[PDB]
Design a protein around this nucleic acid. Structure first.
Lengths: 117, 101, 54, 109, 142, 149
RNA sequence: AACAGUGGUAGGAGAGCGUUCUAAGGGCUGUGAAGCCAGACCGGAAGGACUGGUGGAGCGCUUAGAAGUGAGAAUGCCGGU
RNA sequence: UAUCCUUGGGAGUCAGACUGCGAGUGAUAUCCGUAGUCGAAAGGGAAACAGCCCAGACCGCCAGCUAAGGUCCCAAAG
RNA sequence: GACCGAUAGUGAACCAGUACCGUGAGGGAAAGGUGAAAAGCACCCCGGAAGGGGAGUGAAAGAGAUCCUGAAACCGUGUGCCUACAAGUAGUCAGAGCCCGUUAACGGGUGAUGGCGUGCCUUUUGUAGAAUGAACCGGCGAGUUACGAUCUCGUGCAAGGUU
């Protein structure tokens, strides 16, 4: 028998154009450029999903550095003291509490200074 | 106001709020207790060196589910290499009732 | 010289910005004429603000 | 609301649109006065369409003149005639004689 | 889930004198203050800096022979146009512009950098008109 | 195919180097491969056929779907009589009638019923018996089938 | 369970998704089928449902069989713009 | 430490590139032996830079420790 | 008939070896569908007419003569968010403000700012290339069948197997 082959290509091509909604100009209407761009955004997301993990540690480090320098310490000395004054396992994210409640952060800095000298 | 450690990560919890964490392998309805309490805030302040001694945080489980689907697609130009798959990471939702310092 | 590449819709629409007409000069009906043009005759009877001609 | 449509008038689009841009949203008497004073090809056609719409509104739906405004007005494209023009060195070129539809909808303000 | 910042901030006013201090060793600190890295609520995509007023900008200092050797170039986009000025003329004729150039070269490029630069006020001499803003003296920590 | 479509034979006319107007990629060109007349049929060893017919016959006996009756006789070729005979037994679905030699009255009486098929003992086969549900067979046909196999 | 492993072109091996036709059973349609349009649903991928509009008479599910079996490129062919 | 042999079924490839280490040339202004990487390999450092240095991507996390390289501001850290 | 269903099947489902091209031998197309039934829109209004708006037939007039269904490219009208100090393979991650409210889901649309980021295929030792190819959309378009050779797997019988 003969398989005419209709109703299959349109259904598959239309799904590609639906993911390209919101693109600039002909990139959201023409099939070829839409497919090219959807493929390119495929690994742009994979690359960024791992950069995001190392782009917030930098922010936390900067904020902790500023907060510590408000007390007379530096970031490196404060971290060494914390690692040595016991440990007090505290991710930089959870040591960002300098922004919200600054008093406790000063207590932690005081403990680190007490052990550091 | 307590800092607890779970799922290889750390979170800050006060009673009455709801949080999403990694799978606890607990059927929805029972009560879980977190043992690793690092910090306690509010009025008096307690700082345990590895942990605060004798501190347990209570929570109850009401839902275990999966997040929105993420489609992972990668390819290599001019070498005809494609790969596509999907992912839905499981999660467990819990609300705190007693910090219990 | 031939075009190097086609022009997108946005560039064409932006080029046609100044390609439009103008609203004409509107004046009074001369000798109950029909809304004649400035410094000209009435459409009805060739009137100049009531001064009919032709 | 009253509607009047003219189909396949021998006038290319993008030429009727220039005039139609002038009379969109204006009062009926002002629109007619504007159309009577611009020397272009599409003005007599658009004036006839507008007056047909006015007559329909007055007669069929029993509406009133001196109170109507041009609520909607647009020009669409229609079937195209294709012709051929000979050129130098035994070549041919294509000519597109285009046609348009004109629609006007008036309503009480 | 940390906290960003959005328009709910306050900008203080600081006054720094440039008597004796060297060029770069002051410009670096001033730029750091301008970007807002000295406060725990830092945010990369939002302006969180302060306002910096510099007085006595004509008494700046340079080490070595740079005062007669450092040359400022500019190009006018016309053929053969390359204008040059020695540091001595820049110091004795346009003292504020040298400081502005030194600080501006130390700021990030883009829209936010150019909007950050608008908070710097440089005055030759020991007098400024910014009185209603109540400036607060600030020494160079570094 | 390419060499049977009427026309072609010459070059059509920096365009692509066309060779014929009946090439496979043109609008009305020839067909590459596609159907061709042939015959689908093979044969199996005789013992395989014998084992197959034995198995399909025994499968019905396993679940008592074989009804053997003393003899089948219809004086008149009336479809009403055949319907009455079928209703007398518990036969409501398609059934297969097997009789020794050949009876004209039975063949002409059950012909029009939608689900009934009449064959002789010599014409039994696997597909016919595996298709119909209930198999009615005359005792003489049983004996002759036993003799043949 | 406990250990161990999972980059990949030319290539070798394995498991699967879809389209048209045929055979039996089982059953959906004028109380609206195929097709077309929209949506914030479901699987690890190829893919599959569920609601609403249009449409106005034919289609699908389970197990097998047979193939004119899946299109982004050939200065590809035809048509429309 | 887990690779090795024999038989049988399928292949593709057929006188590549650069950088270190030891011998012989143009005119030490290509040759052979040996090791690596790219070809078929993403990530971090050399400002950008197939072949140099570190190191081998099943997927997710707003967790931690380090290699080459670094800690005045661009740009995380003296 | 486990053959096609209007780019398929004869070149030709239609006044087809016709129209058209060539002095001549010769080459050689494109083009199916109102409705069960013409019941194919009497009559009124604008208009020179074409074309429209009512009324009417009909289950449907958005079935009105190229008339079942009506996709994409292409052309327009209205509106929610953004946009006139800004350097751009335009996407991806983070993110204020504004507008909504779904197959209720750690929802939808838009998007100031910050980081990163030299299209697709072919070929080559090596390509972002200033090495080749594509104006865009849609349809058609490439590992088969017959007879022999050898190997793997399955079934029947077995010193026999088989027409």
């Amino acid at each position: 028998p003969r398989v005419k082959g209709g109703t299959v290509t349109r259904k598959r091509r239309k799904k590609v154009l639906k993911l390209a909604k919101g693109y600039f100009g002909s990139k959201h209407t023409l099939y070829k450029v839409a497919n090219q761009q959807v493929m390119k955004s495929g690994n742009y997301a994979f690359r960024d999903r791992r950069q995001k993990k190392r782009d917030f540690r930098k922010l936390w480090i900067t904020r902790i550095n500023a907060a510590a320098r408000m007390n007379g310490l530096s970031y490196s000395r404060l971290m060494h003291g914390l690692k040595l004054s016991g440990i007090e396992v505290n991710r930089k994210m959870l040591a960002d509490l300098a922004v919200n409640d600054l008093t406790a952060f000063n207590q932690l800095a005081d403990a680190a200074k007490a052990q550091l000298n | 106001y307590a800092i607890i450690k779970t799922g290889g990560k750390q979170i800050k919890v006060e009673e009455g709020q709801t949080v999403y964490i990694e799978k606890l392998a607990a059927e929805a309805g029972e009560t879980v207790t977190f043992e690793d309490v690092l910090f306690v805030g509010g009025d008096n302040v307690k700082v345990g060196n590895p942990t605060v001694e004798g501190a347990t945080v209570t929570a109850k489980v009401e839902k275990q589910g999966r997040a929105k689907k993420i489609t992972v697609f990668r390819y290599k130009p001019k070498k005809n290499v494609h790969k596509k798959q999907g992912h839905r990471q499981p999660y467990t939702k819990v609300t705190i009732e007693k910090i219990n310092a | 010289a031939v075009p190097f590449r086609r022009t997108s819709k946005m560039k064409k629409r932006l080029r046609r910005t100044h390609f439009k007409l103008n609203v004409p000069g509107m004046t009074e009906c001369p000798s109950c004429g029909e809304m004649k043009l400035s410094h000209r005759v009435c459409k009805a009877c060739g009137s100049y603000n009531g001064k009919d001609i032709n | 609301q009253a509607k009047a449509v003219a189909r396949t008038v021998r006038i290319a689009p993008r030429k009727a649109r220039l005039v139609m841009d002038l009379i969109r949203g204006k009062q009926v008497g002002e629109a007619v006065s504007i159309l009577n004073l611009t020397p272009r090809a599409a003005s007599p056609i658009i004036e006839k369409v507008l007056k047909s719409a006015i007559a329909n509104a007055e007669h069929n739906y029993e509406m009133d003149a001196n109170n109507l405004v041009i609520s909607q007005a647009f020009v669409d494209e229609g079937p195209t005639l294709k012709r051929f023009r000979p050129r130098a060195m035994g070549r041919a070129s294509q000519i597109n004689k285009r046609t348009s539809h004109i629609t006007i909808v008036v309503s009480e303000k | 889930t940390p906290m960003a910042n959005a328009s709910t901030i306050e900008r203080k006013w600081l006054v720094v004198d440039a008597a004796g201090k060297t060029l770069g060793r002051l410009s670096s600190e001033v730029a750091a203050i301008l970007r807002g890295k000295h406060k725990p609520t830092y945010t990369p995509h939002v302006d969180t800096g302060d306002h910096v007023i510099i007085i006595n900008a004509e008494k700046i200092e340079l080490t070595g022979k740079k005062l007669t050797d450092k040359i400022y170039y500019r190009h006018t986009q016309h053929p053969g146009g390359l204008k040059s000025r020695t540091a001595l003329e820049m110091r004795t004729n346009y003292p504020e512009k040298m400081l502005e150039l030194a600080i501006k070269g130390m700021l990030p490029k883009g829209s936010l950098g150019r909007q950050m630069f608008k908070k710097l006020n440089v005055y030759r001499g020991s007098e400024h008109p910014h009185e209603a803003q109540k400036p607060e003296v600030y020494e160079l920590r570094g | 195919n390419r060499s049977e479509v009427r026309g072609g034979g010459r070059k059509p006319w920096g365009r692509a180097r066309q060779g014929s107007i009946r090439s496979p990629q043109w609008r009305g060109g020839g067909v590459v491969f596609g159907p061709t007349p042939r015959s689908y049929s093979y044969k199996l060893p005789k013992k395989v056929r014998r084992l197959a017919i034995k198995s399909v016959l025994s499968s019905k006996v396993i679940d008592n779907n074989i009804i053997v009756l003393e003899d089948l006789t219809l004086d008149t070729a009336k479809t009403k009589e055949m319907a009455a005979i079928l209703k007398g037994l518990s036969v409501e679905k398609k059934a297969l009638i097997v009789t020794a030699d050949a009876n004209e009255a039975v063949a002409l009486s059950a012909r029009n019923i939608p689900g009934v098929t009449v064959v002789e003992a010599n014409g039994i086969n696997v597909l016919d018996v595996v298709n119909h549900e209930k198999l009615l067979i005359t005792k003489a046909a049983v004996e002759k089938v036993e003799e043949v196999l």
